[PDB]
């Protein structure tokens, strides 16, 4: 393996002492080689206990090194002091960067010394600069200095990659060495006593700078990383938006030669149309003012790149312009104070001189859309609106509530804020009213939360009480169903692939058509959202209170009206210093259940009005209006060909007419491409944002290092597929430090390639990128059962809370409200849902995961001896694999590439077998009980509970079905027709299609039903054993791509799988689960 | 066609605001085909009716 070779040179770099030793640990599937592994590991612990070498021992036990596989590498290091600064002065050659002070409009966001920015010790909030990743700066500088000594002696091409990653390191190292490397605590939080003399934003600058200089490959990358590393030391605020500004304009200049398209039922076609790009002179005057704001900010090598591209305006050099936009978001987050983020957001200027003739049409268009979404589930009395108190409470999001409450659960009292834990307390103390929702007014205001965006100003968010979730769950779950059957709302075009969903932009683009994409400056706190948006919905629930006749569908529709009356005036609770500031804010509340289902109504019903007022001058015929919250486009098809004046006079008539409703906007029109989400259609080729901060998190999580090392790799493979190539030798160096564990003092344990890359709970990174590899060899399926044996752990906090008198009083009050019977297969099935729902609490899931890893250390310091006969996914593929016969085969390049930023070893698969044409849905069949229970009751049972029901008596299935609420003639038509007997073979087959994934980070892009992959896969057909047929044609279609990515060549399989081995595998596929299947092997 | 009574009453107005504005016309009202035409939208005529 390649990763093990990077391990044994990382140890020889960080521990350059003669007192240091490395002890490899080995394991094997053989019972004979295991005793070869026990004796070898014992002797290296006795010989290295008292100063004896290992070169005389590795020859004697060379029967175990070349045959068994590496488990871990133990590290002895009697080094008292970290030698980071001792080898930092070797690279600290350049002049130190002096910070600037006149570049920011605030004081704390400037780059001042922390002694001058915070006067005393007690008012030191690190939450403006905190990287909140579980690594350090001292560990990052060892990850670059390891790379800068391995690639010192290089060939004449790879030297220039090393040289450009060195002059960008002397900018970093000569600034850090001037103030010294900061020393963190054990929680990876930079304290005040170390940051007394260091400049503020030195950790989050040098973390965002090291992420950049491990991505500098070409000279086009070096001019960007030289003018962003120097500048991000000075202005932390304006820099991320000045560079990322013209990419909203530059998407409208490129021509269309041959573009993709998606037809009406969402499937992919290819089109060949040639559409000119028509931009007026007021775009090249708005682009020159976007290139003079980048010259006053100091940077001068970026607008020379753009102005050398504006004379071309060609799609061949647009991968350079998408690279400049993506490097802008890597400067780090824009975190600021909670007071200045709200008070700059909650400040808005309303005006009584707004056009009231346009609001009474905008209110009515919200009225006629809310009625249109609920006219069918209210006229027919639906099973989910009649149970709004229960379906909102039984499926309750457990993220957070407003305040911190002292919850007492039996003996163990806990300070929690989770939302379903507040429901358990108030249902125990009786202070929980089902039909009364609390008023958010000048008394009891709304608390606040924040979300940080890598380039945007820090925004606020609203945390409503839990009684504003039970009132709004059942109605808005009926509005998301209509948003998946309408061509306008963007819950419809939401699939796995991105060419299918955002490819209806280029359906109506021609030379007589004009696309129109507008982004409101702030969708919250607009004038058209305070009064005319609530009173359009309250009117829609007056016409819906006349549609039905129940006392219970009206009552849930008089609660969803009461939450809009109470939010017409609102107050936010934000503290500062010692005073609490209550700010009136009657606008929309980003943070309800309603905040996306009613940002697609209020923005469609707004743009259906502003497209009506511009039709007094230009007569057109609109084709689609797709809307996604704020971000919406609307294609307009004209009579004449679109010229340079119809583009200018529509962009002046959509901007001004939006200003007639006091909504400040910029209105951009083009004919070639838009920027709807961060996914950019440019010239018929979808381009992505590609900015994910590796070494900077927006907030500290509920996860450990072994899980934050997986999201460092998962944020890299998304960064690589989207066009931002970070060096794999740096990501692998950063996994060998995060997965480090200190057993005792001066002893670190490092797992090998087989512990991290195997398919289990403890997975960090794949061996070769973009592909999953299920290792079918006997030394690798044997360790998968060793890791699948300890994943089932119990946490003592979740079992002290599950046996309390409060949690049992919540399940028994929820089981009594649901079922009007006695049965305990639901009370034992509801209580297993809220025990699973309490994993969102932080010390519960941390004591789950720490009991996973601390039990892994007992497995890694010794050779593994755990032998078990469990059927895994990796045991199915050991029986299929010897019956494949490979043969080399040639396959031409037919289809066109649609994403130019993809890597070369992925783009060659797309050019040969094609991008995905349609989203494959092969999930078998749902059982006939779950179509009978989910249609009457709102209780969705797990499929391991519906198998437990079927294996009961005939008279105990009928008692269970009548228990939920099913009538007697419907259960007796179920049970009497013996279709409970057929559902044994549809539950057990539902775990086969769940098993293997045709979607991944990379596998979504390809077409798996292509007529060029079906030509290479040559498998003979057997009529029976249907479960085996699926897993043969899926594993064969995955084995060719997993070979054609690694080596760039195509192979053609042949699986003459015999009839005697299919029936042995048919019972292996039905015995993965832990339930009684009728057909077993032995 | 159901809007008849309020549309007999529009052309009585459209040909009265023409009829008494034409009395304030001293220049000769010659009618020939001009080069550039002032464009009228039929989506703006379905608003007046």
């Amino acid at each position: 393996g390649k990763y093990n070779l990077i391990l044994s040179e990382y140890l020889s770099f960080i521990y350059n002492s003669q007192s240091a030793v490395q002890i490899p640990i080995y394991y094997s599937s053989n019972s004979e080689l295991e005793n070869r592994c026990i004796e070898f590991h014992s002797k290296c612990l006795e010989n290295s206990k008292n100063g004896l070498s290992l070169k005389k021992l590795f020859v004697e036990y060379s029967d175990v090194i070349e045959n068994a596989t590496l488990l871990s590498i133990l590290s002895y290091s009697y080094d008292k002091y970290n030698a980071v600064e001792r080898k930092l002065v070797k690279y600290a050659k350049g002049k130190p960067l002096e910070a600037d002070l006149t570049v920011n409009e605030l004081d704390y966001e400037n780059n001042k010394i922390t002694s001058e920015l915070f006067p005393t010790a007690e008012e030191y909030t690190d939450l403006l600069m905190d990287p909140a990743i579980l690594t350090s700066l001292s560990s990052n500088l060892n990850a670059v200095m390891f790379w800068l000594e391995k690639h010192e002696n290089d060939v004449a091409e790879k030297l220039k990659i090393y040289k450009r990653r060195l002059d960008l390191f002397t900018i970093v190292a000569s600034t850090v060495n001037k103030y010294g490397v900061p020393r963190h605590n054990a929680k990876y939080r930079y304290e005040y006593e170390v940051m007394k003399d260091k400049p503020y934003y030195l950790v989050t600058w040098a973390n965002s700078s090291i992420e950049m200089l491990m991505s500098v490959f070409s000279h086009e990358d070096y001019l960007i990383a030289r003018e962003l590393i120097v500048l991000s030391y000075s202005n932390r605020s304006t820099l991320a938006k000045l560079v990322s500004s013209p990419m909203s304009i530059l998407v409208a200049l490129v021509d269309i030669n041959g573009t993709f398209i998606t037809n009406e039922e969402l499937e992919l076609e290819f089109s060949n149309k040639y559409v000119r790009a028509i931009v007026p002179d007021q775009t090249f005057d708005e682009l020159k003012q976007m290139l003079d704001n980048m010259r006053k900010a100091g940077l001068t090598d970026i607008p020379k790149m753009i102005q050398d591209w504006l004379v071309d305006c060609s799609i061949e050099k647009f991968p350079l312009m998408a690279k400049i936009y993506s490097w802008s978001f890597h400067v780090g987050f824009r975190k600021q104070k909670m007071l200045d983020a709200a008070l700059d957001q909650l400040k808005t200027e309303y005006t009584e001189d707004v056009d009231d003739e346009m609001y009474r049409e905008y209110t009515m268009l919200i009225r006629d859309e809310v009625v249109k979404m609920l006219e069918e589930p209210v006229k027919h009395d639906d099973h989910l609106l009649q149970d709004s108190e229960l379906a909102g409470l039984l499926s309750m999001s457990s993220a957070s509530n407003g305040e911190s409450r002292q919850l007492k659960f039996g003996r163990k009292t806990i300070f929690s804020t989770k939302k379903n834990m507040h429901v358990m307390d108030d249902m125990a103390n009786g202070r929980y009213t089902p039909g009364i929702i609390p008023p958010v007014n000048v008394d009891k205001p709304i608390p606040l939360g924040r979300r940080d965006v890598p380039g945007r100003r820090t925004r606020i968010i609203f945390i409503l009480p839990y009684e504003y979730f039970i009132a709004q769950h059942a109605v808005v779950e009926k509005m998301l169903i209509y948003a998946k059957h309408t061509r306008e709302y963007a819950e419809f075009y939401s699939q796995s692939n991105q060419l299918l969903s955002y490819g209806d932009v280029t359906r109506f683009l021609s030379n007589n058509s004009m696309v129109l994409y507008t982004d409101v400056s702030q969708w919250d706190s607009s004038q058209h959202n305070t009064q005319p948006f609530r009173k359009g919905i309250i009117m829609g629930l007056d016409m819906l209170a006349n549609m039905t006749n129940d006392a219970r569908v009206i009552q849930t529709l008089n609660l969803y009206k009461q939450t809009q009356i109470n939010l017409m005036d609102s107050y936010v609770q934000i503290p500062d210093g010692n005073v609490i500031k209550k700010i009136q804010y009657g606008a929309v509340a980003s943070g309800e259940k309603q905040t996306k289902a009613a940002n697609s109504i209020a923005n469609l019903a707004l743009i259906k009005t502003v497209l009506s007022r511009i039709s007094n001058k230009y007569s057109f015929a609109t084709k689609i209006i797709r809307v996604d919250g704020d971000d919406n486009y609307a294609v307009l098809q004209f009579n004449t060909e679109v010229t340079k004046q119809m583009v200018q006079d529509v962009s002046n008539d959509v901007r001004e007419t939006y200003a007639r409703m006091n909504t400040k906007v910029k209105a951009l029109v083009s004919t070639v491409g838009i920027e709807i989400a961060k996914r950019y259609i440019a010239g018929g080729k979808i381009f992505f944002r590609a900015g994910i901060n590796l070494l900077n998190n927006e907030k500290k999580g509920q996860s450990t290092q072994w899980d934050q090392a997986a999201v460092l790799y998962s944020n890299y493979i998304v960064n690589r597929l989207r066009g931002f190539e970070t060096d794999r030798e740096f990501i692998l160096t950063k996994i060998m430090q995060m997965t480090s564990v200190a057993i005792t003092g001066s002893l670190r344990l490092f797992p090998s390639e087989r512990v991290l890359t195997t398919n289990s709970t403890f997975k960090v990174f794949d061996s070769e990128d973009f592909i999953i590899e299920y290792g079918t060899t006997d030394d690798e399926v044997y360790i998968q059962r060793a890791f699948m044996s300890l994943s089932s752990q119990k946490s003592g906090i979740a079992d002290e809370i599950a046996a309390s008198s409060t949690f049992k009083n919540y399940v028994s009050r929820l089981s009594e409200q649901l079922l009007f019977s006695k049965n305990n297969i639901v009370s034992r099935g509801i209580a297993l849902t809220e025990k699973a729902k309490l994993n969102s609490y932080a010390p519960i899931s941390l004591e789950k995961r720490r009991a996973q890893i601390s039990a892994l250390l007992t497995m890694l310091q010794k050779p593994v001896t755990f032998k078990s006969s469990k059927i895994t996914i990796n045991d199915i593929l050991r029986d299929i694999k010897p019956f494949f016969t490979v043969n080399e085969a040639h396959l031409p390049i037919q289809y066109q590439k649609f994403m130019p930023t993809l890597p070369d070893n992925v783009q060659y698969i797309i050019q040969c077998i094609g991008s995905r044409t349609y989203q494959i849905e092969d999930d078998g069949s749902k059982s006939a009980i779950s179509r009978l229970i989910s249609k009457y009751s709102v209780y969705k049972p797990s499929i391991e509970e519906l198998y437990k029901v079927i294996s009961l008596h005939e008279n105990e299935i009928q008692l269970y079905l009548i228990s939920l609420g099913i009538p007697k003639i419907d259960a007796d038509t179920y049970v009497g027709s013996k279709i409970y007997s057929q559902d044994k073979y549809r539950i057990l087959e539902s775990y086969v299609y769940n098993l293997l994934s045709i979607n991944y980070g990379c596998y979504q892009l390809f077409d798996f039903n292509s007529p060029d992959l079906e030509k290479l896969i040559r498998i003979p057909f057997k009529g029976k054993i249907p479960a085996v047929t699926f897993i043969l044609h899926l594993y064969a279609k995955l084995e060719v791509i997993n070979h054609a990515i690694k080596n760039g060549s195509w192979i053609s399989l042949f699986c003459n799988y015999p009839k005697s081995e299919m029936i042995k595998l048919w019972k292996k596929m039905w015995n993965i689960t832990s339930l009684r299947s009728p057909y077993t092997n032995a | 066609s159901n809007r008849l009574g309020q549309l007999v009453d529009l052309t009585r107005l459209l040909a009265y605001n023409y009829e008494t504005l034409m009395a304030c016309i001293t220049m000769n009202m010659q009618h020939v085909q001009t080069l550039t035409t002032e464009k009228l939208q039929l989506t703006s005529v379905t608003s007046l009716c």
């Binding site: 028509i278 004449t640 060909e641 010229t643 004046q645 | -």
Partner: peptide
């Protein structure tokens, strides 16, 4: 600045 459209240039020879 891009080349002008053929429609906008030929209302301008008229105008």
């Amino acid at each position: 600045t891009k080349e002008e459209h053929q429609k906008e240039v030929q209302y301008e020879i008229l105008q």
